[PDB]
Each structure stands twice: as structure tokens, then as C-alpha cells.
């Protein structure tokens, strides 16, 4: 089986930058080399076939070159919608094989999160459970801190965080923190707050609600 090697494995660049990715084949594959794009949570898409031929509807800023064992994929001017993992693939000998992929990340300016708090629904409380959700929307960079406060007292458990991949339009991240309590424990307290720390915030931001309101 032909071994396909990609370099770099990962890279960060700014909107407007010229980006070049290399693909190396363990033996001569002539011009039978393709390039695929895989955007976060999406299926792969064909960009380039036969080393340099553009597939229909593919942006003109993409191009391919090379022959034999050494190939290059180029983005003439990086755009936010280019956040993805790029794969090279040989179509010379069976079995057809892929490169290990190149993850392309976007460097941008600091952006503060918009912070939102969600009390448990009246429907969930019927099943004797209470889930409180804190939302940090569209921030840059990824690094963010969230603290849960119940009646001004810090929570030392029963919370979980989830973070999205870089957005295809503004290169931002979004984060959710979910605090889970039984209805009994939930009804013991009044103030529910989530405190957020991020580079784009001059001081920590707190979003809160009173149980029942």
C-alpha cells in the first residue's frame, strides 16, 4: 500500500494570508493525486482532482501542483470559510490511500463572549430534575473560565462543559456549561449565577436569575 504523508499536520493563519500544504507519496503516482476538504461536522468534499483540476463550484483561490512523489495544495488568500481539515489521496494503485490530514485554524482579533443564563423548564421539573445552562456565545480565543454560584456560594461539582469548533463565518468559539441538580436541591436555593472570565472582558461578567421568576 502507498504511504501518503502530509506536512504540516496543523497550522494557524490569518484572513488574507497565502497558505501552502504539502503531500508526499512513498512511490511515483504520476498525476493521480486528489485533494478533499472536510469542514467541522460535515462530510468531505472534492476540491482538486488529477493534481491540479478544479472540481465544479470550488473557489478559484484553491489550486494544486506537483508530480511523481511531491505535491502542493495552495489557498491564494485565506477566508473564514476555509476552517477545515484537508486530505490528499492517491488514485494510482490499489488500495487507494489517504494522507493523515492537515488541520487549518484561523488566527483573529480578541472577541468578548455574549453571556446568557437559562433556568430549568417547568416540564423538566415534573420529572424531578433541574438543569441550569450557561451560554458563552462567539468568543476569541478559546480559553474561557466559568464558575457556578448558588446563593453566592461556589459549586464544587455537578457541572459539564461543551465547546464548538471555529465558526465558518467569524472564526469564533461558543461554550455551554450545564449544572444538574435534583428538584429537591434546586428548591433549597434562590439565586443561580454563572460567572465568566475571558481576555476580552475587563472584569468577570455575571448572569443570574431568582428561582420562580
Amino acid at each position: 500500500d502507498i504511504q501518503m504523508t502530509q506536512s504540516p499536520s496543523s497550522l494557524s493563519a490569518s484572513v488574507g494570508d497565502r497558505v501552502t500544504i504539502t503531500c508526499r507519496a512513498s512511490q511515483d503516482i504520476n498525476n493521480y493525486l486528489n485533494w478533499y476538504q472536510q469542514k467541522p461536522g460535515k462530510a468531505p468534499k472534492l476540491l482538486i482532482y488529477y493534481t491540479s483540476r478544479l472540481h465544479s463550484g470550488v473557489p478559484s483561490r484553491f489550486s494544486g501542483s506537483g508530480s511523481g512523489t511531491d505535491f502542493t495544495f495552495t489557498i491564494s488568500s485565506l477566508q473564514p470559510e476555509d476552517i477545515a481539515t484537508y486530505y490528499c489521496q492517491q488514485g494510482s494503485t490499489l488500495p487507494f490511500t489517504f494522507g493523515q490530514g492537515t488541520k487549518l485554524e484561523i488566527k483573529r482579533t480578541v472577541a468578548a463572549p455574549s453571556v446568557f443564563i437559562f433556568p430549568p423548564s417547568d416540564e423538566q421539573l415534573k420529572s424531578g430534575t433541574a438543569s441550569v445552562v450557561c451560554l458563552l456565545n462567539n468568543f476569541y480565543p478559546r480559553e474561557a473560565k466559568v464558575q457556578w454560584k448558588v446563593d453566592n456560594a461556589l459549586q464544587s461539582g455537578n457541572s459539564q462543559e461543551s465547546v464548538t469548533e471555529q465558526d465558518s463565518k467569524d472564526s469564533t468559539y461558543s461554550l455551554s456549561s450545564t449544572l444538574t441538580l435534583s428538584k429537591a436541591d434546586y428548591e433549597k436555593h434562590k439565586v443561580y449565577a454563572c460567572e465568566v472570565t475571558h481576555q476580552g472582558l475587563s472584569s468577570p461578567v455575571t448572569k443570574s436569575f431568582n428561582r420562580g421568576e
Binding site: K45, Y50, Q89, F98, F118, S131, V133
Partner: protein, 211 residues
């Protein structure tokens, strides 16, 4: 246009078997070679194999020839993948592809196959009510295996949508939330519904999210 839809995915016991189907439209299936590609979570793409139009040439990756059998039915325009004696290392999203020019010019959305001894559970959907810009969403709690797909107003609302990656709870069940930011002035006028789909348990829920 060319359409490729994978089905038959979901939960499988270790050492068990499963059959995947790829239903097609927009082209004369009987004139094309057809292929399968897989991708384990957070990993790269792996070529499974291919099948020619009259089924006389069936090629595989040598390391995977024992675990897979590719076939097709030209009358039904359908591609098949027979999976045998499945291991944890076979947990992956399975993509149906169309060889052209070769290169693979069209790919389906893929179907996730989970290899585990655990059991299938349908989720519970709760609203995240909104209280210049407002945020609202849906909490999809306690399901197994992955995945759940979330859309808003049957795919009509896509801007400002963030569907978070699922988190595995202490119970062994997955949970996630899907959110959307909208104009605060539209909260009393426009209707917001989250469309939750958990194919492994065949659960379909349309939750109205009102302030």
C-alpha cells in the same frame, strides 16, 4: 443533483454483524463504480473498497477484507455494506461515495456505527426559553448511542445556530444542547421549534420554544 443517503447504522454488539445501505438519486447508478470510506471519531479517512457496475470487480483494503463485503442492486439504485464480526476499532462514520474522472466527486452525509455491549435509549427534549439580541435553545438529555441531529424550524433557521458536541454523563448516557441567537423584537411574533432526531432509537421530537 447527485444525492447519496446512508442508512442502517447505529448500535452493534462486539463480534456482531450489520448491513448498511446507500440509496441514491440524480444519476444512472448502473453506469458508475461505487465506494465506501470510513472515519473513526476525531481520526482520518480510511478507504474500505469499491464495486464496478456489473459487480465483476470488487476491491478492498487487504487489512479490512475479512470484516467487510461490498455489493449493489442496480434495479433499486442501492449500494450495500455487509459488516461482519465487528470490533471496537470499527466504530466509525461510514460514507457512501461515487468514483468519477479516479477521484470521489460525491459523498453522502455518512452513518455512525457504534460497537458496544450497552443498550439503545431515546432522549428527552426540554426548551431553553428566551428571557437587541436574544438566545434560545433545546436541551436533548439522556440518550445512547450517538448521534442526535438538531435542526430549527425544519431547516429554515440556520444563522446564529450552535449545536454543541455531546457530553458523556456519569450515567453512561449522552446529553447535548443546541442554541440560536435571534432578534429580541421577534420573540413575541416568530415561532421557534427544534427538530430532534435520534435514529438509533427512531425518536423524532419537534419542541416549540416560547418565551
Amino acid at each position: 443533483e447527485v444525492q447519496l443517503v446512508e442508512s442502517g447504522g447505529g448500535l452493534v454488539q462486539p463480534g456482531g454483524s450489520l448491513r448498511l445501505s446507500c440509496a441514491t438519486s440524480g444519476f444512472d447508478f448502473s453506469r458508475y463504480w461505487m465506494s465506501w470510506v470510513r472515519q473513526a471519531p476525531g481520526k482520518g479517512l480510511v478507504w474500505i473498497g469499491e464495486v464496478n457496475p456489473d459487480s465483476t470487480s470488487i476491491n478492498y483494503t487487504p487489512s479490512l477484507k475479512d470484516q467487510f463485503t461490498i455489493s449493489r442492486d442496480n434495479a433499486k439504485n442501492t449500494l450495500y455494506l455487509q459488516m461482519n464480526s465487528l470490533r471496537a476499532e470499527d466504530t466509525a462514520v461510514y460514507y457512501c461515495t461515487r468514483p468519477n474522472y479516479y477521484a470521489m466527486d460525491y459523498w453522502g452525509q455518512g452513518t455512525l456505527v457504534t460497537v458496544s455491549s450497552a443498550s439503545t435509549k431515546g432522549p428527552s427534549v426540554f426548551p431553553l426559553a428566551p428571557s437587541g439580541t436574544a438566545a434560545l435553545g433545546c436541551l436533548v438529555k439522556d440518550y445512547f448511542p450517538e448521534p442526535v441531529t438538531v435542526s430549527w424550524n425544519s431547516g429554515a433557521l440556520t444563522s446564529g445556530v450552535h449545536t454543541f458536541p455531546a457530553v458523556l454523563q456519569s450515567s453512561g448516557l449522552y446529553s447535548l444542547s443546541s442554541v440560536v441567537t435571534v432578534p429580541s423584537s421577534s420573540l413575541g411574533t416568530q415561532t421557534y421549534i427544534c427538530n430532534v432526531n435520534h435514529k438509533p432509537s427512531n425518536t423524532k421530537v419537534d419542541k416549540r420554544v416560547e418565551p
